[PDB]
Design a protein around this ligand. Sequence first.
Ligand code: NAD
Ligand code: A1IH7
Length: 288
Amino acid sequence: GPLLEMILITGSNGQLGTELRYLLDERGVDYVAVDVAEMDITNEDKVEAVFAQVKPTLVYHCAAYTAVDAAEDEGKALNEAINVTGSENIAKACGKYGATLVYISTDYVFDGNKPVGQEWVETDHPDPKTEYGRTKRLGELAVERYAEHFYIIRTAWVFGNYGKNFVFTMEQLAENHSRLTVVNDQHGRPTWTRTLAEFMCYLTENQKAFGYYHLSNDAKEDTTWYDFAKEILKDKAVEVVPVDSSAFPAKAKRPLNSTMNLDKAKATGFVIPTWQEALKAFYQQGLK
Ligand SMILES: NC(=O)c1ccc[n+]([C@@H]2O[C@H](COP(=O)([O-])OP(=O)(O)OC[C@H]3O[C@@H](n4cnc5c(N)ncnc54)[C@H](O)[C@@H]3O)[C@@H](O)[C@H]2O)c1
Ligand SMILES: O=C(O)Cc1ccc(CO)cc1
């Protein structure tokens, strides 16, 4: 209420939701955690029922549908339900209960038509070309409309120890395949869920200004998926082969350069590791 902070985590068993739960555990912060089997964000009656019981003042919205290629076709309906309907439901619930809403969005809200070396800023106009990115942008607009107190954090290429991601896909494939093909003409930056969870909590702990923030891990140089995969699999007996995006017919028309400018997040005081340092820490944390 006005005197008690009450934290609700949605999508709490995802890779980001789990990371955040563990982070708040470390800091001795209490929360209520829900995922599909406790509060299906597409069911507005269930969302209302949970909010009536919990009365959150702060909601970390980590539920999402993030299968980019499936969202173009076989998962098109579920992508829309979770990322549009679900986003609207959570933003409306937060507005009704007066809760601050931290909404995680994506670098894929941009069209990607930006020269290598240039970066997308929070004030740039979204124009997404993937089903996934379209629905996340609609989720941003719902949050903007219904949650008066909000942080929209656009992140990218998310990986961490507590769910499925590009890193574990690559390692699984390397267990039985000697040659892998990874695009070298799609530019962006990985984001470790631990960095993202820490930034999520840095904004709220320090009551930074509401609005939009870009958060990926950082890079001294250009980064493509190939660069990421090459580093992921450097201890493996697999050849990572750079290809361009026309080498194989892809279902999703992914942005060619969705590298996010990080100046605004840096201006908060938050220190952003490079993705190389983050990946090394991810490997160390996974041993726990
Ligand atoms: N995977 C990426 O590279 C990537 C890239 C850009 C942005 N993001 C954003 O990161 C956020 C979450 O990241 P993640 O990597 O942990 O995704 P994730 O797939 O690991 O898990 C997200 C959680 O959403 C849950 N969920 C789905 N539908 C639900 C529903 N109807 N009700 C309740 N829960 C539901 C899922 O079961 C899951 O636990 C999302 O906002 C995503 O859009 C991710
Ligand atoms: O492609 C996939 O299914 C996983 C994925 C999702 C979103 C983004 C955008 O950052 C990148 C990768």
